[PDB]
Write a protein that binds this DNA or RNA. Structure first.
Ligand SMILES: [Mg+2]
Ligand SMILES: [Mg+2]
Ligand SMILES: [Mg+2]
Ligand SMILES: [Mg+2]
Ligand SMILES: [Mg+2]
Ligand SMILES: [Mg+2]
Ligand SMILES: [Mg+2]
Ligand SMILES: [Mg+2]
Ligand SMILES: [Mg+2]
Ligand SMILES: [Mg+2]
Ligand SMILES: [Mg+2]
Ligand SMILES: [Mg+2]
Ligand SMILES: [Mg+2]
Ligand SMILES: [Mg+2]
Ligand SMILES: [Mg+2]
Ligand SMILES: [Mg+2]
Ligand SMILES: [Mg+2]
Ligand SMILES: [Mg+2]
Ligand SMILES: [Mg+2]
Ligand SMILES: [Mg+2]
Ligand SMILES: [Mg+2]
Ligand SMILES: [Mg+2]
Ligand SMILES: [Mg+2]
Ligand SMILES: [Mg+2]
Ligand SMILES: [Mg+2]
Ligand SMILES: [Mg+2]
Ligand SMILES: [Mg+2]
Ligand SMILES: [Mg+2]
Ligand SMILES: [Mg+2]
Ligand SMILES: [Mg+2]
Ligand SMILES: [Mg+2]
Ligand SMILES: [Mg+2]
Ligand SMILES: [Mg+2]
Ligand SMILES: [Mg+2]
Ligand SMILES: [Mg+2]
Ligand SMILES: [Mg+2]
Ligand SMILES: [Mg+2]
Ligand SMILES: [Mg+2]
Ligand SMILES: [Mg+2]
Ligand SMILES: [Mg+2]
Ligand SMILES: [Mg+2]
Ligand SMILES: [Mg+2]
Ligand SMILES: [Mg+2]
Ligand SMILES: [Mg+2]
Ligand SMILES: [Mg+2]
Ligand SMILES: [Mg+2]
Ligand SMILES: [Mg+2]
Ligand SMILES: [Mg+2]
Ligand SMILES: [Mg+2]
Lengths: 119, 114, 56, 123, 209
RNA sequence: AGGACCGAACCGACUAAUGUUGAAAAAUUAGCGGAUGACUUGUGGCUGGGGGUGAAAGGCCAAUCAAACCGGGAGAUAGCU
RNA sequence: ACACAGGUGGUCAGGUAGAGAAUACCAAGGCGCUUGAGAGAACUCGGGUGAAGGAACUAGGCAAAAUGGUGCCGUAACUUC
RNA sequence: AAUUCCUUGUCGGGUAAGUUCCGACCUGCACGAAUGGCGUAAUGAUGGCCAGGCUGUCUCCACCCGAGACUCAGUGAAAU
RNA sequence: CGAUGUCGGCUCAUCACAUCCUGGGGCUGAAGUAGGUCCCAAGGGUAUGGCUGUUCGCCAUUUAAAGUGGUACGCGAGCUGGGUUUAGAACGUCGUGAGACAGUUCGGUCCCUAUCUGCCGUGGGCGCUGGAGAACUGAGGGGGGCUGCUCCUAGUACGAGAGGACCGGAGUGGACGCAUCACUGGUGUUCGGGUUGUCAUGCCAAUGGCACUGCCCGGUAGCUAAAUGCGGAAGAGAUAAGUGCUGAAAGCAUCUAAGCACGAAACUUGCCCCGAGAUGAGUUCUCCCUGACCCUUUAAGGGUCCUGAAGGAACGUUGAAGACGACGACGUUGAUAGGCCGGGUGUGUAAGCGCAGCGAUGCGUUGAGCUAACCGGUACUAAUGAACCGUGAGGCUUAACCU
């Protein structure tokens, strides 16, 4: 059973699931919007927003933690430089998901996940 | 929750001394037999602590008569009359389960300063 | 594991009596786009509840 | 928590060093016997000269178990081994004169007052 | 035997002054007031119906709203029926407090248990697994045999096999009432109640003992 | 120096599991034995069926062997379904 | 018979760890193996852990579990030495 | 006893229990000396028994990690 | 014999009583405990290991008991293959010999994706006569019905003694089934750390990837048993064997021909669950729909404009619910999910700095840092203004009833 559990397997092992989500977050931060399946994006809004609320405060320890979590110095620098002050006045909810039809390749529910301040 | 963590706090004892795993602890337990009740003492090294408010407990192990004895005293149980600390030990971990492997001059702990 | 008597076309039809497809109950129309879109989804242009969300 | 084919130590000066539990008494299909329960056992290794010899079959009382016994407050007293005290198969009384190591107070009935008195320490 | 209804807050322990840790169950009980009183003539059976709380303000349908308005009480959750004993009757306006269970010793509770989904025979009916080695192939937790050869050539009704366990109504009887808090509207039992935290349970005076 | 020892390529298949209209008309994974010699392998040739060869199992002779395959007598014969 | 978890002879043989063509991660270099997206029921396959007992299971220690390397000390009956 | 029907022949060991095993008794249905009789160090993916460690083999199963099984979209057999 | 898998073992059961225990009674060579036999009674239960392929059997220890049978000597489209019963080889015997011996010995492919019936769950359609939201009554069906040990009655009755009660209560127990994590722990490859080899971040530091989660130590939520709560009727009715009261036939006598009365874990209730497809389709509470025309085949007829109410359906966030279906709670007049704040809980004094030490390392910052699923809140994000199904007064006869 699954009483009061959390975390979607997405038919992948832990290493595969984390390595995919790392690149997903690294592309989402650098493009401010991406398109992916809704179940796979519902975990992005749980794996990226804590990173944003961590980058809200600039510190050596926080920056090294972000580097250990994302494995991209450019991504960490862009996070801390831009998304910190931009979302510093907002208490959560840094991502928005909008469903757009279904993919023709697999007939999968797909959505654009973006930042609240894309424009 | 406003009912649980209001009933589980009305009968808590606000006198538990601060202690850490690896510190020798003496516990006074009420033992009742017949018509009267005495206060027995159990002195040993604390190896594990599980604190959840009223559901708090701690495990104490002592080498008594050559055979190790481990008890699990509930922190807020009325039988546990008093808790005292007689020594302090410097241990990296918080769960001392490797002590069950060593005997003699190998299961002993260093002294924690200050 | 296998059949002993060949079934009817009636049995096949009664088995297929439940796999019939269904359509959308009622398509929604955007407030300031005038086009029909699936409910709680965005339009093919990029509009959703008035304000456009995907400007190309 | 003692069952068949379980190796236990002996906690009296009877000469037995290693015994094996071979039956659990107290009802049909009984699986595990706690502290203060009677179990039939056989001798596997004994002192060269003593009150008992190897290969005997006799009853015993469980005095210690690694699983332990839960107090009515949630406290459990856990030991580092399984030990028993030999008894006569008819009189149900201890054979040895001394008791080795600490004991619990679960066996504090009329049938084990001698064991309680002879125990160096009662928990 | 006028039982009441409440919400399970959970379970905890009580430390008695003589050194006993009694596992008790915290059950939130509000004033189950009334919706209808069915008499001996209109419905035959003599019973009452109760509701507690409001539950919402814009999700009660017109029939339920009119039913509540006829009685004169506010909205609430699902209605609960209780067959009333001979010699006692209650007014529509009058409510039922938790004070009624002050002079009772043991009660019985009823509620929907946790749902385990479609469980196997080893869990739903507690069968015994087979050997995992010595030659066994693809038959470890299967029930194995269900009938006999050609007589009766069929499986009997009520056979214990894989199915959906849990999520059903279960009653636990003879639980000792250790505390009845009137000002806080709370009741405590000896534990082992069915369901989960925040579920809905129905308690009543014990009929077994 | 050993028809030596442990152990890789290489040769083989002793156990278990999977597989049995399978990835495969004998295979895969985890284990296994020999592994400087009576070893293994590439190329070319000879041994042709009542015969060949066989450290010998009635084993192999092109997925077929107590008598290989193809064509003929031959629509052999069948008191048998 | 397949765009088949099978077989096929030789040549060149990098760094660190490592006795080693054993094994781990990498270089030059090549691939993601021609269906995916969901949920995380029972049961199947490949595995991890587990309170107490430790072969009591079984036809059978089958499977599983366990040891496992270097230097030194030290090593019994028997024996063709 | 790779050989014995009576046989689970009798005795002693091993366990509480041992139709298996070990050493003897010799009543050899129906051992026996190159179709070889008895031993034999080493050797054996050879048969049987026992002992120490070890563990879900088991009392008694419980949870977890992946691939199927369940749903959706595309393609799409079979024995009978 | 155009194919019905045979011994034994594991899982799963069902039925019968010629009843192993419990329950009731009669006769006893039944003083009491404890026995023998018979009758009624199938509600429940009915062991673990060594030997050998076991069935059977011997032995060891328990239990109140370790019952006999039918169901292809139950169950291989649930499983193995230890035996028999193929192909190799030997032993002893048989025969000159090829080869045989319910004689032995070592080894020796158990294949099937469920069409229908059978059973466990869970849905779609329609019915129940206007359409709805609820509570149920209960025709009926299903689940449990085990019993040991001590104390008082007591060393009382009985018995010369030895020994030792029936009846009635109380406590503690074992095997079951139900329900939970308040405690004990297991798991918890999604939480925190220790550590080896290698690669990379221009390099130290700090990290990430792989090597079974690399190997490990603990551990949140959830699930779990080994953990803790509950139950095996108390009682009522009619009763089986069997006791009787009043009683004639048959002046007596007799439990029976009338009548009356006691009498089992057997039966129905009493305990729990499902349950109006109970088509015999049921009751109560609250709601909603109160416009006009036209047509022929003049009737439970059809069509047009308006109307579209109660409610339902659909979609989105989701769940202690769940294979998919299905069932909770919410959709701005809101805490339903995500994020955030604070706390709790786990791991363990985070990096960065300064010191001390040649160095490996320790110290202060600092019980710090991090913290998945936990708890109180917070509309910050996502739950849309709509639109879609559902009607507009609900047939005939008769009955009581007010006009
Ligand atoms: Mg959740
Ligand atoms: Mg998939
Ligand atoms: Mg279909
Ligand atoms: Mg298997
Ligand atoms: Mg197979
Ligand atoms: Mg069958
Ligand atoms: Mg060799
Ligand atoms: Mg070798
Ligand atoms: Mg080579
Ligand atoms: Mg090899
Ligand atoms: Mg191999
Ligand atoms: Mg020839
Ligand atoms: Mg061939
Ligand atoms: Mg050919
Ligand atoms: Mg021809
Ligand atoms: Mg001719
Ligand atoms: Mg012909
Ligand atoms: Mg002929
Ligand atoms: Mg002829
Ligand atoms: Mg391919
Ligand atoms: Mg290939
Ligand atoms: Mg090379
Ligand atoms: Mg390699
Ligand atoms: Mg590599
Ligand atoms: Mg772990
Ligand atoms: Mg274990
Ligand atoms: Mg012999
Ligand atoms: Mg010979
Ligand atoms: Mg060899
Ligand atoms: Mg499909
Ligand atoms: Mg057939
Ligand atoms: Mg036939
Ligand atoms: Mg009878
Ligand atoms: Mg009887
Ligand atoms: Mg009789
Ligand atoms: Mg042969
Ligand atoms: Mg075999
Ligand atoms: Mg085989
Ligand atoms: Mg059929
Ligand atoms: Mg019993
Ligand atoms: Mg837990
Ligand atoms: Mg724990
Ligand atoms: Mg970790
Ligand atoms: Mg580098
Ligand atoms: Mg009678
Ligand atoms: Mg009954
Ligand atoms: Mg803390
Ligand atoms: Mg540090
Ligand atoms: Mg926190």
């Amino acid at each position: 059973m699954r009483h009061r559990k959390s975390g979607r397997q997405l038919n992948r092992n832990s290493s595969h699931r984390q390595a995919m989500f790392r690149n997903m977050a690294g592309s989402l931060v650098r493009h401010e919007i991406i398109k992916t399946t809704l179940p796979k994006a519902k975990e992005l809004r749980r794996v990226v927003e804590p990173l944003i609320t961590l980058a809200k405060t600039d510190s050596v320890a926080n920056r090294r933690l972000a580097f250990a979590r994302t494995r991209d110095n450019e991504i960490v620098a862009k996070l801390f430089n831009e998304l910190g002050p931009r979302f510093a006045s907002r208490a959560g909810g840094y991502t928005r998901i909008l469903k757009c039809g279904f993919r023709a390749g697999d007939n999968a529910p797909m959505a654009y996940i973006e930042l609240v301040d894309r424009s | 929750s406003n009912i649980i963590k209001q009933l589980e706090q009305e009968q808590m004892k606000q006198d538990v001394p601060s202690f850490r795993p690896g510190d020798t602890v003496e516990v006074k337990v009420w033992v009742v037999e017949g018509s009267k009740k005495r206060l027995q003492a159990f002195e040993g090294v604390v190896i594990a602590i599980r604190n959840r408010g009223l559901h708090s407990a701690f495990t104490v192990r002592k080498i008594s008569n050559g055979e190790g004895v481990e008890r699990v005293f509930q922190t807020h149980s009325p039988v546990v009359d008093s808790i005292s600390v007689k020594r302090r030990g410097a241990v990296r971990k918080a769960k001392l389960y490797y002590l069950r492997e060593r005997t003699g001059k190998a299961a002993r702990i260093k002294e924690r300063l200050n | 594991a296998v059949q002993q008597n060949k079934p009817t076309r009636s049995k096949r039809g009664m088995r297929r009596s439940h796999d019939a497809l269904t359509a959308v109950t009622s398509l929604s129309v955007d407030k300031t786009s005038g086009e029909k879109h699936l409910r709680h989804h965005i339009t093919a242009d990029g509009y959703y509840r008035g304000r456009k969300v995907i400007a190309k | 928590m003692i069952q068949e084919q379980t190796m236990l130590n002996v906690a009296d000066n009877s000469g037995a060093r290693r015994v094996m539990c071979i039956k659990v008494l107290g009802g049909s299909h009984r699986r595990y016997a706690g502290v203060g329960d009677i179990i039939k056992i056989t001798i596997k290794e004994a002192i060269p000269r003593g009150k008992v010899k190897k290969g005997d079959v006799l009853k015993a009382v469980v005095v210690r178990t690694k699983k332990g016994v839960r107090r009515p407050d949630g406290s459990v007293i856990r030991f580092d081994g399984n030990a028993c005290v030999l008894l006569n198969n008819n009189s149900e009384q201890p054979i040895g004169t001394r008791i080795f190591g600490p004991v619990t107070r679960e066996l504090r009935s009329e049938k084990f007052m001698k064991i309680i008195s002879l125990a160096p320490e009662v928990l | 035997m006028i039982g009441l209804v409440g919400k399970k807050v959970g379970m905890t322990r009580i430390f008695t002054e003589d050194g006993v840790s009694i596992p008790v169950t915290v059950i939130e009980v509000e004033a189950n007031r009334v919706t209808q009183v069915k008499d001996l003539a209109n419905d035959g059976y003599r019973a009452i119906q109760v509701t507690t709380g409001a539950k919402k303000a814009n999700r009660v349908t017109k029939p339920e709203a009119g039913h509540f308005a006829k009685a004169g009480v506010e909205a609430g959750r699902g209605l609960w029926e209780f067959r009333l004993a001979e010699g006692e009757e209650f007014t529509v306006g009058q409510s039922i407090s938790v004070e009624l269970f002050a002079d009772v010793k043991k009660v019985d509770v009823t509620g929907t248990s946790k749902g385990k989904g479609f469980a196997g025979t080893v869990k739903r009916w507690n069968f015994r697994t087979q050997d995992a080695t010595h030659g066994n192939s693809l038959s470890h937790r299967v029930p194995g045999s269900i009938g006999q050869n050609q007589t009766p050539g069929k499986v009997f009704k009520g056979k214990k096999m894989a199915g959906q366990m849990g999520n059903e109504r279960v009653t636990v009887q003879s639980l000792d009432v250790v505390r009845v808090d009137a000002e806080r509207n709370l009741l405590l039992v000896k534990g082992a109640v069915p369901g989960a935290t925040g579920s809905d349970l129905i308690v009543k005076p014990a009929v077994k003992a």
